Amino acid sequence: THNKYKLNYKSEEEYPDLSKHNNHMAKVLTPDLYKKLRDKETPSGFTLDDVIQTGVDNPGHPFIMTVGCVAGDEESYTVFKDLFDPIIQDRHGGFKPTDKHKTDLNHENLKGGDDLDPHYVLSSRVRTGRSIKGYTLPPHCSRGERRAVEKLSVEALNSLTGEFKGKYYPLKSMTEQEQQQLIDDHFLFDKPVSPLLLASGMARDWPDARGIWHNDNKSFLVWVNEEDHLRVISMEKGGNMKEVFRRFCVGLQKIEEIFKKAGHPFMWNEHLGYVLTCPSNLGTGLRGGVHVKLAHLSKHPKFEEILTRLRLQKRGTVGSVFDISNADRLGSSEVEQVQLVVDGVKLMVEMEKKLEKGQSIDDMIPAQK
Amino acid sequence: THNKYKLNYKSEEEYPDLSKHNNHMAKVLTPDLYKKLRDKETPSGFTLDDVIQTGVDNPGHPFIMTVGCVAGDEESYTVFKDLFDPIIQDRHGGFKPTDKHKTDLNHENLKGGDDLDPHYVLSSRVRTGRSIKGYTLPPHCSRGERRAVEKLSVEALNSLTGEFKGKYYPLKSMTEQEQQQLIDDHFLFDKPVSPLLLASGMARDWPDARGIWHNDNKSFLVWVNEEDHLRVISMEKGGNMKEVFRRFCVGLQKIEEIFKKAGHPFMWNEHLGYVLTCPSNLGTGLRGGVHVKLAHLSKHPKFEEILTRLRLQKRGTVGSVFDISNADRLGSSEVEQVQLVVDGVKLMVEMEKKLEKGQSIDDMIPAQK
């Protein structure tokens, strides 16, 4: 956006006013850091102003900190490491610039995911995101890049067979019937309404080159060109998390090898693992989650503390069902994260059964993991 | 946004999909025109993709056509004239590339604005917008440019005296009391919610360097760095449109001469008149309006046709009050536009008085102006 033209202004005159802001970007940005990085750019011309814009536009709420910045590029994380590195270290529990992310795509290293109590575990899912090397990320990508990402993705997905045979639904030419089926399948996405996403520029040209793919069994779902180039979900009613995770891993490997053959592998490096637009999703990008009925445990005074010790977190959803998933993303592997979900949920179901009988769970509260 | 990087893609691969669109941009853009202009840029790096983005994002509704493009720059209108010229010609009643806009800032050339019936005319207002030469327009301007626009504007406004003595209210440091006073004064603006405005990038860094100035008499109002660099309104209860227009003109002249002395005159040329972000506002940028009670005439079968013949238009607002203003912007002067409002409203009040008595108005229906 006229970077050499903006660089005619003094850094002070361009420096954002972040006095009311509560996000990770505003905590780290200083006048000196802005001055040092304002003249840099990635090979695709992504700038510091572009990385920080959503954090400038969205000061947020004192209760919760947002990240407040995006990568437009693989090399955004390097060119602007003096911004991203302290953000990453704060957001991801001390993960340092010299630390290494371990990736583990072997679902057989999972131990015991198959027997989660279906009276309590209503469903099991594992999701992640992926970027495709050679293309810039949604905040920045051109219509041509986004179209090339779609074409590669659909051709890969159309070639899968067996359990992974499926069909692609472009948002632009979706019929009302096809839309309505995807809504009550819970497979549809639409244009983001989040001001954090909109202010980053990722919703441009909507719905061009966005779409939905899913397999015939409706157990493996891919979203194309939404928040990241790809978002991949494996899901199942019940509690066979091991089977969900196998299908997740095998399905991703099949897409990965097609993309590698085309010279466009999944974006990855040994420091950050899989890179994606939002720094909070780095590493595994993985949210492995259950829906669990915790009628009694959710009322226990230590419910929040138990979740912390198990390194899990909850969001919203018969009766008092909770959407529980791993909190970690960077500095621990896909297997370790799903293992934490498996072990943690198994314990919390045991806790719930105890409270059903009026028995204390305090001896069951684990030490911090 | 990486223009040379986007220019590595073929023009076909970057060409927007506008098949579902109903805006002036989509009517004019062709593959050949996109290919010819995609590699151009203004001195501030504004590109064709930037001019058209809001029209790509907002296909709109079949009933009403939107413009679907913005200028980021004074020279956007020249660099991309092969896009803007046919849009302007369609939007502004045949106004050709070689035509000249006449500007007339002498309120004394108005004839007879003082005696509009106050039993029917509840209020009178004249608004316009202005851009400041040397700074890019809100879709594109940097925080430093926007801050410089504010500083120049406030210093000019703070120096006015007499009828035009006033005070500036920055949005960022506004107290609740100051806000609440401006709301029930009807002087406040906030962050735009229009997807047409948001998709153009003009709401970046909100509320930085936005604010409100008004005189002590609450009859002259200036908005800084909202849709355009300046939006200026003169208003009054009642029907002394001549006095509103005098105050409007004199207040603008006082701001104009300060800005000229600083080497930053109002942006203007002989072809387009005052230039602004939206092509529909070129020429005068002027919306001169009344609120009028037309209890009987608004029900007459020819109400819409009478408005057309008078070159006026209505929007929404005791009983059945209509917000009536001039439809023209480009190819006619400020005086001619307010004159059309004065003469047209006077006729429609006379029509209303006739219908109050059960008398026909057909002999009063004017020929097309």
Q: How far apart are CA A348 and CA B12, in angstroms?
A: 56
Q: Which of A87, A97, A80, A96 is closest to A65 using CA atoms?
A: A87
Q: How far apart are CA A82 and CA A55, in angstroms?
A: 16
Cα-based angle A81, A53, B208 (whole degrees, multiple of 5): 130
Q: Is A83 in contact with A42 (CB distance < 8 Å)?
A: no
Classify domain B3-75 by CATH number.
1.10.135.10
Query: Rounded to whole angstroms, what are the CA distances from B145 to A12, A216, B203?
Result: 12, 54, 14
Q: How far apart are CA A109 and CA A65, in angstroms?
A: 34
CATH superfamily of B107-364: Glutamine synthetase/guanido kinase, catalytic domain (3.30.590.10)
Domain-by-domain residue ranges, chain B?
Answer: 3-75, 107-364
3-state DSSP of chain B: CCHHHHCCCCHHHHCCCCCCCCEHHHHHCCHHHHHHHCCCCCCCCCCHHHHHHHHHHCCCECCECECCCCCCCCCHHHHCHHHHHHHHHHHCCCCCCCCCCCCCCCHHHCCCCCCCCCCCEEEEEEEEEECECCCCCCCCCCHHHHHHHHHHHHHHHHCCCHHHCEEEEECCCCCHHHHHHHHHHCCCCCCCCCHHHHCCCCCCCCCCCCEEEEECCCCEEEEECCCCCEEEEEEEECCCHHHHHHHHHHHHHHHHHHHHHCCCCECEECCCEECCCCHHHCECCCEEEEEEECCCHHHCCCHHHHHHHCCEEEECCCCCEEEEEECCCCCCCHHHHHHHHHHHHHHHHHHHHHHHCCCCCHHHCCCCC
Residues with Cβ within 8 Å of A177's Cβ and at least 6 positions away in sequence, in order, are: none
Residues 214-233 of B with CB under 8 A from A: none
Q: How far apart are CA A36 and CA A48, in angstroms?
A: 10
What is the secondary structure of A1-39 as a DSSP string? --HHHHTTS-HHHHS---TT--BHHHHH--HHHHHHHTT
Q: How far apart are CA B292 and CA B349, in angstroms?
A: 8
Q: Which of A50, A5, A207 is closest to A140 using CA atoms?
A: A50
Query: Rounded to whole angstroms, what are the CA distances from A29 to A90, B80, B199, B224?
Result: 13, 37, 27, 27
Q: How far apart are CA B85 and CA B95, in angstroms?
A: 9
Smallest CA–CA separation between B57 and chain A, in Å? 5
H-helix or E-strand spanning residue A256? helix A241-261
Across the interface, do B144 and A45 touch by the CB < 8 Å criterion? no
The residues that bridge with A235 in the sheet, in sequence order, are: A125
Q: How far apart are CA A365 and CA A297, in angstroms?
A: 12
Chain B residue numbers touching A145 (CB-CB < 8 A) = 9
The neighbour count for residue A10, using CB atoms within 10 Å, is: 10
Q: How far apart are CA A334 and CA A287, in angstroms?
A: 9
Query: Rounded to whole angstroms, what are the CA distances from A125 to A244, A309, B128?
Result: 6, 22, 56
Q: Is A94 in contact with A87 (CB distance < 8 Å)?
A: no
Q: Left if phi > 0, otherwise alpha if psi is -120 to 50, otherwise beta: which for B238?
A: left
Residue A153: HSE in the Cβ half-sphere, 13 Å Cα cutoff: 34
DSSP-derived letter for residue A274 is E
C-alpha distance across the termini of chain B, in Å = 46
Q: Is B340 in contact with B328 (CB distance < 8 Å)?
A: yes
Select from B14, B20, B198 the Cβ nearest to the Cβ of A142. Answer: B14
Across the interface, do B1 and A140 touch by the CB < 8 Å criterion? yes
B207 upstream amide cis, omega within 30 of 0: yes
Classify burial at A61, counting beta carbons within 10 Å of its beta carbon; exposed 0-12, middle 13-18, buried 19 or more: exposed
Q: How far apart are CA B12 and CA A364, in angstroms?
A: 63
**A250 and B CB contact within 8 Å:** no
Q: How far apart are CA A100 and CA A118, in angstroms?
A: 37
Q: Which of A236, A333, A241, A281 is closest to A131 using CA atoms?
A: A281
Show the tokens assigned to B93.
């009643």
Across the interface, do B5 and A142 touch by the CB < 8 Å criterion? yes
Smallest CA–CA separation between B296 and chain A, in Å? 43
Query: Rounded to whole angstroms, what are the CA distances from A250 to A106, A362, B123?
Result: 9, 39, 70
> Sheet harboring A287-293: ordered strands across?
A166-170, A211-215, A220-224, A230-237, A121-130, A287-293, A321-326, A312-315
Q: How far apart are CA A101 and CA B1, in angstroms?
A: 31
The residues that bridge with B233 in the sheet, in sequence order, are: B127, B221
At A168, is the secondary structure helix, strand, or coil?
A: strand
Q: Which of B88, B90, B205, B183 is closest to B139 using CA atoms?
A: B205
Beta strands in chain A (DSSP E): 121-130, 166-170, 211-215, 220-224, 230-237, 268-269, 273-274, 287-293, 312-315, 321-326
The residues that bridge with A290 in the sheet, in sequence order, are: A124, A324
Q: How far apart are CA B336 and CA B341, in angstroms?
A: 9
Residue A58: HSE in the Cβ half-sphere, 13 Å Cα cutoff: 21
Query: Rounded to whole angstroms, what are the CA distances from A34 to A13, A77, A133, A246, A308?
Result: 11, 15, 28, 45, 35
Residue whose tokens read 């097309």 = B368
Q: Is the dihedral of CA A168, A174, A177, A183 positive or negative?
A: positive
Task: Give the count of Cβ contacts less than 8 A between chain A and B.
Answer: 98
Residues with Cβ within 8 Å of A250's Cβ and at least 6 positions away in sequence, in order, are: A107, A164
Q: Is B143 in contact with A47 (CB distance < 8 Å)?
A: no
Query: Rounded to whole angstroms, what are the CA distances from B260 to B59, B72, B133?
Result: 40, 21, 9
Show the tokens assigned to A172.
């632009």
Across the interface, do A144 and B1 touch by the CB < 8 Å criterion? no
Residue whose tokens read 């793919």 = A213
Q: How far apart are CA A287 and CA A167, in angstroms?
A: 24
Instruction: For strands A230-237 and A321-326, give the pairing.
Output: unpaired
Q: Is B228 in contact with B276 (CB distance < 8 Å)?
A: yes
Question: A3-91 adopts what CATH topology?
Answer: Transferase Creatine Kinase; Chain A, domain 1 (1.10.135)
Q: What is the resolution of this structure in A?
A: 2.0
Q: How far apart are CA B73 and CA B195, in angstroms?
A: 21
Instruction: For strands A312-315 and A321-326, give the pairing.
Output: antiparallel
Q: Is B16 in contact with B50 (CB distance < 8 Å)?
A: no
Mutation target among B4, B5, B73 for the A interface, most CBs of A within 10 A:
B5
H-helix or E-strand spanning residue A217? none
**A11 and B CB contact within 8 Å:** no
Size of chain B in residues = 369
Q: How far apart are CA A203 and CA A191, in angstroms?
A: 7
Q: How far apart are CA A264 and CA A247, in angstroms?
A: 23
Residue type, B100: K
Q: How far apart are CA B54 and CA B68, in angstroms?
A: 6
Experimentally, the structure was elucidated by X-ray
Residues with Cβ within 8 Å of A181's Cβ and at least 6 positions away in sequence, in order, are: none
Smallest CA–CA separation between A66 and chain B, in Å? 16
Q: Is B300 in contact with B163 (CB distance < 8 Å)?
A: no
Smallest CA–CA separation between A337 and chain B, in Å? 37
The values of phi and psi at residue A303, to 5°, are -55, -50
